[PDB]
Amino acid sequence: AVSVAPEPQVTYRLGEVEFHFHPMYPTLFSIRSLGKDPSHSQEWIDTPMSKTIQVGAEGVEYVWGNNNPVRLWAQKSSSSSAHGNPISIVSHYYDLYPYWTITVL
Amino acid sequence: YESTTMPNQVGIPFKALIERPGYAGLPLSLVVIKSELVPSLVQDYITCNYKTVV
Amino acid sequence: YGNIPISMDIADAFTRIDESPSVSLKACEVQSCTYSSDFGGVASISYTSNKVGK
Amino acid sequence: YGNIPISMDIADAFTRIDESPSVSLKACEVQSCTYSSDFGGVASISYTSNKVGKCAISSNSATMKDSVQDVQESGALSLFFATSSVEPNFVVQVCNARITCGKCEPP
Structure with missing residues (x-):
């Protein structure tokens, strides 16, 4: 039987996930990805810090101590509705990846 | 998701719907009865009548 | 004085649509017109609907 | 990842054709447009039906979450979509x- 500290609070914005890390005593955390291109790190969070990762409904996973991992597609209580041009383009109005700035140029 | 701007005019009812577009049957109505400026003060000094006795 | 920004995340889904009647025969009647402006507006709006909803 | 080509004989005939709704006044309303990336989809379509049946619905360039609807009469019909x-x-x-x-x- 083991207990470790609270899993990071999530805050949400337009195409954005922000995480507040919150420990009690030093807790091992991993930052990974498998809805995105491979990455791995390990660090101990002894003191809170915010890490912001963007997710456009791809999939980002965070691993916090001895608790189940959580993967999110940035699910909220909102939805889209027939967005995006018929020929391939990027999520939301925002210019990046340039496909809204290409018409200006 | 969020976020409207009502002006501060008292007793006029403003209506907000917001979370995502579409219609709701229960929406938020909010009215301001009053703004209230309440002190947070430093007492500079006190003065009062005094009884001078000769 | 000023404007008050307000933000809310409120549950209004529920089940969407929460009933939206389509509407026809839209009219504006304006009556009770007497000068002043320190009191509220009095308009009457006439319409006819093809469904009941909220 | 990977694509599955599929083939089927669903035991067609049956006693086809003997039901086939037709539908008139076809429209799209857009609600719940927010610029958050989710998988949901919340829209309505307005139409009128007068043919009582189930047709095989829907679509080969669009995705509804419904697929069986006995339409006898019709108005505004809210549907879920995989947006x-x-x-x-969507067609x-x-x-x-x-x-x-x-x-x-x-x-």
Whole structure:
């Protein structure tokens, strides 16, 4: 039987996930990805810090101590509705990846 | 998701719907009865009548 | 004085649509017109609907 | 990842054709347009039906979450959609009948 500290609070914005890390005593955390291109790190969070990762409904996973991992597609209580041009383009109005700035140029 | 701007005019009812577009049957109505400026003060000094006795 | 920004995340889904009647025969009647402006507006709006909803 | 080509004989005939709804006045309303990336989809279509049946619905360039609807009469019909999943475009059909939709993309 083991207990470790609270899993990071999530805050949400337009195409954005922000995480507040919150420990009690030093807790091992991993930052990974498998809805995105491979990455791995390990660090101990002894003191809170915010890490912001963007997710456009791809999939980002965070691993916090001895608790189940959580993967999110940035699910909220909102939805889209027939967005995006018929020929391939990027999520939301925002210019990046340039496909809204290409018409200006 | 969020976020409207009502002006501060008292007793006029403003209506907000917001979370995502579409219609709701229960929406938020909010009215301001009053703004209230309440002190947070430093007492500079006190003065009062005094009884001078000769 | 000023404007008050307000933000809310409120549950209004529920089940969407929460009933939206389509509407026809839209009219504006304006009556009770007497000068002043320190009191509220009095308009009457006439319409006819093809469904009941909220 | 990987694509599955599939083939079927669903035991067609049956006693086809003997039901086939047709539908008129086909429209799209757009609600719940927010610029958050989710998989949901919350829109309505307005039409009128007077043919009582089930047709095989819907679509081969669009995705509804419904697929069986006995339409006898019709009005506004809210449906769920798989938006920003594998459809960013939709050719909306309700039976043999169709329009293309929808809206919401500001600059």
